[PDB]
Structure 1
Amino acid sequence: MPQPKTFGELKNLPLLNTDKPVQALMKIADELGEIFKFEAPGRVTRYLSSQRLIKEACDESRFDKNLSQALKFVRDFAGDGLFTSWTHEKNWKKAHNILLPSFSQQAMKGYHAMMVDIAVQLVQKWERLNADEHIEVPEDMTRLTLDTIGLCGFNYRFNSFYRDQPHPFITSMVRALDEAMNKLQRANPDDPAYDENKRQFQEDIKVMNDLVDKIIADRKASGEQSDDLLTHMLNGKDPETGEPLDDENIRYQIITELIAGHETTSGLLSFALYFLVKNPHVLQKAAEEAARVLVDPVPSYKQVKQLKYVGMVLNEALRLWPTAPAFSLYAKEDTVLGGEYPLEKGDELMVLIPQLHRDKTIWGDDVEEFRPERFENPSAIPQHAFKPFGNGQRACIGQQFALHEATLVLGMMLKHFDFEDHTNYELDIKETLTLKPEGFVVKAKSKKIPLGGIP
């Protein structure tokens, strides 16, 4: 098994002392192949890139979700929420059972109005820009996804489109996620040089906890019901144990929904618009569908479901740049991977999704091209070839929410504006916990189509 450059004591770790670790790992994969070993002080990981090996890794009888170093650090503020719990932790099963119906296709009918509320705000913002002015794409997409999850999660308005400086909760969340990712590169965590980082981290945790805990308390006092996750959780009983989630876990689920959902989804919308402006004939086809389908001043749930080609566009963006680009597994028992790589019980595997999605033996020679028509017939895609939302029982619980949101918003964008790549933008991918196009800007010329009133 191949292995990239080592640095004594530090092993491979310094290779990731970069602002773009995942793209670093992709370049290494390009040279080394379908599997390579990556060592840090005190840990070992095997990175997987081929569909041949990843299909075995996705066999839940042999491998289970692992809490990576990154997820362990995120747990300091996401607690035992769904994203950062072990599969066999009692609160995982319990929360999974309770929350499943909150994330179904039927639940999307209830969330639709609040998704439209924020989408309308985004469209109005762009309708109101003066001539020559431009749009900062990832920045606005993130305002949109944070505000949407705020409403659908706990009926709270962050009012991001009313601000230059985000709501303090958002600032704190973003900074805590930053600190979590930065901790990955620290050989000496308790060095006094990180005392300030530690102070800020605890302050940011308190900001998040204080707001969510207060809203939960207030909500239990009012009795108010909404189409939000908080109401569902306050009223929901586990099908198995018959118990509801306790108030602390409810808080962790609300924080979790925001962490897991806002940045992946905004990254997706950003990458999709990028690929559209770089491929004008695809943009035209997608805009034609939007105009054909979205015939009312405000889109309805049933109309979003008709945006088939927009859906193909989103899937092809997720193929090329899956915005949560890696997930971690561990071997349940000793086992041989792909017939040639022995694993010991507890051994960690990392699935490199962007590499999976560029496996020529699956997709063909043109894997680098943006072609939504790949997804015209789903039955064509082999099992475990396309995994932007993870695997099995530990797959993204938010998948239907993300796709409904992104399809609605991209559809409305295409209905209401023509877009210009005015700077001839060169793709630069920023890495946090997730991936996004840094500095992506466009100009949007309104088609001057009336936008209807909302509740």
Structure 2
Amino acid sequence: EMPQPKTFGELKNLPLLNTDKPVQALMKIADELGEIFKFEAPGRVTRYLSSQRLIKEACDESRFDKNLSQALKFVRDFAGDGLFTSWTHEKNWKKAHNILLPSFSQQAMKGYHAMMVDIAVQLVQKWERLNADEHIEVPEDMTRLTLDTIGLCGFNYRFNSFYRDQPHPFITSMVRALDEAMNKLQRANPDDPAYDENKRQFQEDIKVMNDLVDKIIADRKASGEQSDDLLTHMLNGKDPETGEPLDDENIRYQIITFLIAGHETTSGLLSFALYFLVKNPHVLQKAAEEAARVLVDPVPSYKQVKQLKYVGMVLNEALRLWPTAPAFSLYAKEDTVLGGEYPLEKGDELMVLIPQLHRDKTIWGDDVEEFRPERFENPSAIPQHAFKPFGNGQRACIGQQFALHEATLVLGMMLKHFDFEDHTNYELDIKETLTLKPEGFVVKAKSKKIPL
């Protein structure tokens, strides 16, 4: 049979999800329960997977397909038919996949990189122009950078999020909506007077996001166009199979999904990577050397990012220890036995604990908690399906190369232009908005006096 956590009667496991940090609670639960453990809530059942040998079967394209998590279903209201939230047996997913995949490529990455620099320059100039006494809120400023990067590159819109003291209205509203998604999963009873207040708020926040997208289409509508871009590939992009462009109503959904999924994950990754680089001096020294040798010219070139090897290794290791996308869910496409020990009826839902998967001691050695980028010196040596932070198969992050390209480029310039000091020996605190980010992580960054 299949182990499961403590069920309080009617609500079963569901009351456990109330905590600020659900994914970490599930990791604790997985440490004790074992490879797999069942997780049943009233009206929904899902089995969490933590051992790699089960992950490799769950990941097979001809064995299990992607299922929408309970929270992702609520995410649909602003995101919807966007690939991250669209179904695999969904029409719009296939159309959008085929026509937005060419917008991510080597030629594409070249298209986006020159504009990425601009936003990273805004970040570097902000940190260079800070006074000596001031300190930097890494996750906040990383979200600040990532929004502007994705906006300017993939939608020709400058959020100008750096010119704002407080988080952008988009950030506030997005985080708040994710709040309801998670917090309504954990909720026992769907209807109650009080929730109406909440409900009100969540109509409000969403609108802001909607309103913001209205600018991108309107702005580009009024200003000059015909400059190859994601938003172009959405307006004028056409489906090879059906010869059809995207639905305007669906184009806006694409914009929502891309704006949201392009910063939170990348910004959490940058914060986590900087944190781990701060806790270990030597792993920084190596990367500070790499960025200097690889990037000579003041502005990084499209080729210079790919030339950076150690930066990508650092990013992959930091992404291993704390994958910014905490989990993905999968349903069985036909009756199978998982591991040869657990029989599952078709359509059964299994969630996958990516951070617990990376902590499997058998594959990654008996010092998994140890953060050493050198593990990724020969990334070929890593076993199959043991390391899947970006997802699996066709369903895995069309712009993952953009994630790595922006994050590597930015981090290379950060280590190039700055010296990082940790004034609090920061206690690692992970805030969850369906995504993992350090909370309270503050460092100072002295200038290195490098141009542009």
How far residue 218 of structure 1 moved from its aligned partner, in angstroms, is: 5.0
Counterparts of 1:218 and 1:302 in 2: how far apart (Å)? 31
> Does the 8 Å contact 2:50/2:356 carry over to 1?
yes
Q: How does 1:35-46 map to 2 (within 5 A)?
A: 35-46=36-47
CA contact (8 A) 2:175 2:433 kept: no
CA distance 1:271–1:350, shift in 2 (3 Å): same
What whole-Å deviation, never above 9, does each CA across 1:118-140 have from its counterpart, x for those lacking one? 10000000101111211100000
Q: Deviations over 1:221-249 (max 9, x none)?
A: 55612343111111111011010001111
Residue by residue over 1:235-293, the C-alpha shift from the partner in whole angstroms, topping out at 9 and shown as x without a partner, is 11101101000111110011001121211110100010111111100100000011111
Summarize deviations over 1:52-75 as a string: whole Å, max 9, x none: 000000112221100111110000
Residues 104 and 52 (structure 1 numbering): CA distance in 2 closer, same or farther, change over 3 Å?
same
Q: Note if contact 2:14-2:188 (Cα within 8 Å) is conserved in structure 1.
A: no
C-alpha contact 1:63 1:331 (8 A) present in aligned 2: yes
1:446 Cα deviation after fit: 0.8
In the alignment, the residues of structure 2 paired with residue 215 and residue 314 of structure 1 have an alpha-carbon distance, to the nearest angstrom, of 31
2:336–2:345 Cα contact (<8 Å) kept: yes
Q: Hey, what's the Cα distance between the residues in 1 that align with 2:312 and 2:108?
A: 19
Check conservation: 1:9, 1:41, Cα contact below 8 A: yes
- What is the match of residue 186 of structure 1? 187
The number of equivalent residue pairs is 451
Partners of 2:137 and 2:441 within 8 A in 1: yes
Displacement of 1:318: 0.7
Gaps of 5+ in 2: none
TM-score, normalization by structure 1: 0.97
CA distance in structure 2 between the partners assigned to 1:43 and 1:416 by the alignment: 50
8 Å CA contact 2:15, 2:188 repeated in 1: no
Are residues 215 and 450 of structure 1, via their aligned partners in 2, closer, same or farther at CA, if it must alter by over 3 Å? Answer: closer
Once the two structures are superposed, residues 87-108 of structure 1 have per-residue CA deviations (whole angstroms, 9 ceiling, x without a partner) of: 1111000000000011223211
Residue of structure 2 in register with 1:446 after alignment: 447
TM-score with structure 2 length normalisation? Answer: 0.97
Post-superposition Cα deviations, 1:300-338, rounded to whole Å, max 9, x if no partner, equal 111111110011000000110000010000011211000
TM-superposed deviation, 1:194: 1.1
Cα displacement (A) at 1:381: 1.0
Q: Cα gap change, 1:395/1:170 in structure 2, threshold over 3 Å: closer, same or farther?
A: same
- 1:220 positional shift: 4.3
Q: Distance in 2 between matches of 1:82 and 1:397?
A: 9
The secondary structure found in structure 1 opposite 2:243 is coil
The gaps in structure 1 that reach 5 residues or longer are none
Contact 1:152–1:227, Cα closer than 8 Å, also in 2? no
Query: What is residue 291 of structure 1 aligned with on the other side?
Result: 292
> What is the CA-CA distance between 1:212 and the residue it aligns to?
1.7
Q: Is the 8 A contact 2:65 2:88 kept in 1?
A: yes
Q: What SS does the corresponding residue of 1:165 show, helix, strand or coil?
A: coil
Is the Cα–Cα contact under 8 Å of residues 66 and 329 in structure 1 kept in the other structure? yes
Deviation (angstroms), 1:141: 0.3
Ranges of 4+ aligned residues in structure 1 off by more than 4 Å:
220-223
Q: CA deviation at 1:168?
A: 3.0
Using the TM superposition, give the Cα deviation of residue 152 of structure 1 relative to its aligned residue in structure 2, in angstroms.
2.3
**Is the contact made by 2:137 and 2:442 (CA closer than 8 Å) also made in structure 1?**
yes
- Residues 328 and 351 of structure 1 are in contact (CA less than 8 Å); yes or no, is this contact kept in structure 2? yes
Q: What's the C-alpha RMSD, in Å, of the aligned pairs?
A: 1.3
Q: In structure 1, the residue corresponding to 2:239 is in which secondary structure? A: coil
